[PDB]
Design a protein around this ligand. Structure first.
Ligand SMILES: [Mg+2]
Lengths: 261, 261
């Protein structure tokens, strides 16, 4: 099975422009054979808000709102599964979320657990835990952006049987691209970090989207500045068998009685 | 404060030869200003055993046995603190251990929690948890070799206030040197990986000892095959403050409610 990132430059406060760009690139990923496509964090709203009001005013409910229903449409037309970062309105509150859709409809959502820098001024910390979505042919865990920084994020997803971790990102620090192959290695999973590119009100994003294998190899890596799609095939066996040799299995060998105490 | 690795080539079942080599290199690290010097895993006995009995008959007790008393003499003479991997005889049983010694004598021991590969035939799994030893001027966490693979090892040490993780190792895989900077970054600590070199009954070790900073920088790195020492200055303030910006403190931001479940 082929998985893909879409690396795009979301236009702040312009969802329709971002829907148009997303559809375009998701179609390119589809045409290159991808079955799972991952978009960046906050792909619909952009990131660097001055005020909560400017995002709250346009943020969409999940699953009834425009971002989710747009993605359903594209999933249905292209026949791919999509994981995409979106601002989530839920009553008076806002979450920094990711929605999971398939060609047959809405699958689920994840709310970012570890908020980064000024996100804490706009978003409520995620409260649904680290979820793994079973697509039948594979299990997809989701984490967003700065969640990478905590090794417990990827570990919790891998422990719940993620085959691939879809990872919408809007990276500003330089570290994640070198850390993601380690996250893939230490859990024996695949990772798909779909980063944005661009400059938004003085803040520059690092691009460098990448697909990492359970042997910490980089299967696809994107430029710093360009909008692009990257596709790689993934080996479900390389991830469903936690053996690293005949004497060691990663999950059998963990000794939780000695961790965090 | 300056920390150091000693990268050496233990000669299997020849502890007197290994004591002599260690002393030479420890002095050389001391001469370069090191206050803490980390030696490889099983530096006294070597690693690639074929019977329990060949290691059992030579393994020393901690702290009264020959390896800890040797190291105490060296720490007394040179004024340094030493973390060294050693085969621990305890009663009828062996552990794959690390001793911590300083100018005043024995400080403590750690027993390798995650046994690697054939080690399981010779040693009991470690049973003391991940311990942090308070030297006053610094707190030193200890883990051994394959412990690096589980992010939970370093994380447990860091949560207990380690300024530096001393990491005796006998690496055979190529991954640790890429991963150690991410362990240092994600916990905001320093790490000192003291690897061996050499070929031992046909097993090849990879060397490449390294010191990693809390910004994922590598401060010193050794060759694949040479016996050598490596020293770097560490900044304690940089590890004790877990803030990575004015709005994120790594430890406050952890959300253990969502981990491993
Ligand atoms: Mg060097």
């Amino acid at each position: 099975v082929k998985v893909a990132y879409v690396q795009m430059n979301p236009q702040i406060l312009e969802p329709d422009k971002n829907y148009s760009k997303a559809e375009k690139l998701i179609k390119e990923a589809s045409k290159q054979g991808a079955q799972l496509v991952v978009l960046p964090e906050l792909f619909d709203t952009g990131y660097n808000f001055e005020t909560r009001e400017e995002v709250f005013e346009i943020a969409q409910k999940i699953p009834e709102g425009e971002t989710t229903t747009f993605l359903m449409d594209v999933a249905r037309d292209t026949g791919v599964y999509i994981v995409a970062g979106t601002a989530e309105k839920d009553g008076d509150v806002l979450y920094n979320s990711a929605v999971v859709v398939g060609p047959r409809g809405f699958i689920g959502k994840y709310r970012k657990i570890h908020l980064f820098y000024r996100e804490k001024f706009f978003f409520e910390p995620g409260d649904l835990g680290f979820r793994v979505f079973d697509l039948g042919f594979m299990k997809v865990g989701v984490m967003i952006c700065f969640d990478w920084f905590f090794p417990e994020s990827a570990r919790t997803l891998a422990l719940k049987g993620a085959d691939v971790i879809a990872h919408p990102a809007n990276l500003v620090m330089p570290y994640a691209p070198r850390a993601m192959p380690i996250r893939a290695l230490e859990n024996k999973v695949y990772t798909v970090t779909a980063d944005r590119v661009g400059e938004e009100r003085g803040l520059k994003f690092i691009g460098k989207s990448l697909i990492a294998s359970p042997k910490a190899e980089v299967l696809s890596m994107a430029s710093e500045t360009e909008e692009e799609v990257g596709v790689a095939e993934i080996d479900l066996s390389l991830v469903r068998n936690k053996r690293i040799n005949d004497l060691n299995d990663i999950f059998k060998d963990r000794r939780e009685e000695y961790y965090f105490r």
